[PDB]
Structures are given as structure tokens and as C-alpha cells.
């Protein structure tokens, strides 16, 4: 269920940073066990990443703050 | 034959040499799918060694571009043939007339874009009538090099391969003439001292029609040879 990424580019207006952030998100989602924020409909991880981009509930800022928070909580979990 | 011809097609068909042009006129005494026999007219018979003449036709043999050359008879029994006229229809000819294709009922009109730029839209009836299907004889050679670590055999047993691919093979190692081989199957079983048997290439069907075996003077035989 994907034809173009014009809305996603309208969200993050670089057309190149979009590819990097989507690649990072899909890499997080594929090899790891991170769950998608949008329910997938039997689609490849790239378009789930792009759909997360277009609804606006993700970006580079959200991803790196979430990763920093996850790193902080996992290093604090060692006690 | 082509409908809108030129009249030079006869010259090309009789000149190219595929058509068995009658050397001496006469009467067809015996026609057959592999030979044509003429009882020549008494005017053109020699005093001695006249007899009659026999034309040996060429059956399905490989051409230089893997197409099919095939001489077939175009005359009937007891048909008076003159001098310098065709007797055997060759490849892509028709009664001594160069017939390089087929006459098809065309219509110049756009059809839903299936003939968009230069494409051609063809009915199912065209292949139902069996018009453009073409024979393609191709050869596959499996040399047996007496390389290092020992000579290699043409034996009929191949390790680590079940009898499914060896069912078509005989007890000698060669495939039977007439087998309907499919892509990937074994034609001849060659194994080097320690599996390098020749196989049909991927995605090509066919039927084995001729196997010729050449052996060194010093290597005796196998039962198939």
C-alpha cells in the first residue's frame, strides 16, 4: 500500500535525510525486535518505516532521543 | 508462399541449391520422403552408363545458425518433369519459390495500446494453426579428456545422483535416440576421477534425434559405439 513518498518528504523536507532516517528505523525494526508504531498489513519493513514517517510520529529527533533513553535505562538496569 | 511476390523468388530458390533441381528431365519412377527417382527420357539418355539417376534428399540436419534445413518432396508419382525444374521443396521454399514466412491477415488499428510503439498483437488462432513454430536443431558435445589423475569414463552410473535422472540413460552411458529430454536432465554420463556429465542447458526442451560417437584409435569401444 505505497505509491509515492511525497507526503513523507513534506514531513521532512530534505528528500535525502528521509532515506537515512527511514533506513535507520527499518534497520531497528528488522534485525531487532522493535515493534512498529503502525500496524503492518503484510508489507516490507521499508514502507512501514515510510508510513511511520508520513503520520508524523517519528523523525531523527524522536529516534535518537528514544535510543538515548533506551541506552540510559539499559545501563541503569545493571545497578 | 508469399502472395505479393516479385517473380525473382523462383530464381533465388533454384539458385541457392537447397532445392533438388532435376539434372535431366523424365518421369518420376519412385518418390519417397528420403529419395527421388527419375526414369529419364530416351532423348537425353547416354549410349552407355545411362541407367537412371537418383536424388538423395537431406533430412533434418543442423544448419550453421541452429535452424532446420529439410528437403521434402514436392512431386508425385508418374509426373513428367522437364529439365532444370525443382523436385524437392527445401527450407522456407514452396514448389521452387522462396517462402521466407507466412501470409497473415493484418489490420492497421490501435487495440488498447497492446501495439503501442511498434508491438504486434497476434491471435491465438495463429499458433493454433501451427504456423510460426520453428524447428531448432542444436548439438551438444561431451569430450572425454584423458586429463591428469586418470582418464574419465562414459559409464552409466553417476555417484550421488539417483535413478530419476538415469532412467533415460541406457546401460552404456548414452541417451536413447528419441527420448523427450527436459532441461537439466542427463544426456551422457561422464565422471572424472575424484561428476562432470553433460546436461541439457537450463530452460530448453527438445528431443534427441541423432547421436554420433567418435573414439580414439587405441580406445576400443563401448556397447553403444
Amino acid at each position: 500500500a505505497r505509491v509515492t513518498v511525497q507526503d513523507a518528504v513534506e514531513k521532512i523536507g530534505n528528500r535525502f535525510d528521509l532515506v537515512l532516517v527511514a533506513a535507520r528505523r527499518a534497520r531497528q525494526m528488522q534485525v531487532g525486535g522493535k515493534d512498529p508504531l503502525v500496524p503492518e498489513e503484510n508489507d516490507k519493513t521499508t514502507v512501514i518505516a515510510l508510513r511511520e514517517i508520513e503520520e508524523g510520529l517519528i523523525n531523527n529527533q524522536i529516534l535518537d532521543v528514544r535510543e538515548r533513553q533506551e541506552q540510559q535505562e539499559q545501563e541503569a538496569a545493571e545497578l | 508462399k508469399p502472395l505479393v511476390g516479385t517473380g525473382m523468388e523462383r530464381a533465388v530458390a533454384v539458385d541457392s541449391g537447397v532445392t533438388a533441381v532435376a539434372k535431366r528431365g523424365g518421369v518420376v519412377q519412385y518418390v519417397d520422403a528420403s529419395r527421388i527417382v527419375i526414369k529419364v527420357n530416351e532423348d537425353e539418355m547416354y549410349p552407355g552408363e545411362a541407367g537412371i539417376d537418383i536424388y538423395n534428399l537431406t533430412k533434418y540436419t543442423r544448419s550453421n545458425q541452429n535452424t532446420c534445413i529439410n528437403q521434402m518432396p514436392c512431386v508425385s508419382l508418374g509426373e513428367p518433369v522437364e529439365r532444370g525444374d525443382v523436385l524437392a521443396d527445401g527450407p522456407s521454399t514452396d514448389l521452387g519459390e522462396l517462402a521466407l514466412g507466412q501470409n497473415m491477415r493484418v489490420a492497421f488499428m490501435p487495440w488498447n495500446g497492446y501495439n503501442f510503439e511498434d508491438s504486434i498483437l497476434v491471435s491465438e488462432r495463429v499458433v493454433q494453426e501451427d504456423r510460426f513454430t520453428t524447428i531448432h536443431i542444436q548439438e551438444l558435445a561431451c569430450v572425454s579428456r584423458d586429463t591428469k589423475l586418470g582418464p574419465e569414463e562414459i559409464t552409466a552410473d553417476i555417484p550421488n545422483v539417483g535413478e530419476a535422472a538415469l532412467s533415460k540413460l541406457d546401460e552404456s552411458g548414452i541417451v536413447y535416440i528419441g527420448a523427450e529430454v527436459t532441461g537439466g536432465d542427463i544426456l551422457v554420463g561422464k565422471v572424472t576421477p575424484k561428476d562432470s556429465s553433460l546436461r541439457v542447458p537450463n530452460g530448453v526442451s527438445g528431443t534427441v534425434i541423432d547421436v554420433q560417437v567418435f573414439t580414439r584409435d587405441g580406445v576400443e569401444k563401448d556397447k553403444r559405439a
Partner: protein
């Protein structure tokens, strides 16, 4: 001469006849050219190139 030969049969002089759509089944709203052109088949087979 071509038109005379066409008139020898019962074919139109214009060379174009009327065909109906195979699927739709209605008239094509223009006469179209129909004839027998000698159509060769080249040995640039797709399975020799795929």
C-alpha cells in the same frame, strides 16, 4: 490496377473494410485497412535472449 483487381472480387475499392470489436461487439466507427501482408518471423527469439 490494384483497385481493378479489388473490383474483380466483391471487396470495396477503398481497400478498407468494416470490423466489429471482438470484446465489445459494436461497430468500429471508422473503416479500417485489412489485408494479407507477408509477415516474417525473425530468429531473435526471446528465450535465446532471456
Amino acid at each position: 490496377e490494384i483497385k481493378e483487381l479489388l473490383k474483380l472480387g466483391d471487396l470495396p475499392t477503398s481497400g478498407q473494410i468494416r470490423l466489429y470489436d471482438g470484446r465489445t461487439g459494436e461497430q468500429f466507427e471508422r473503416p479500417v485497412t485489412v489485408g494479407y501482408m507477408y509477415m516474417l518471423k525473425l530468429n531473435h527469439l526471446v528465450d535465446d535472449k532471456m
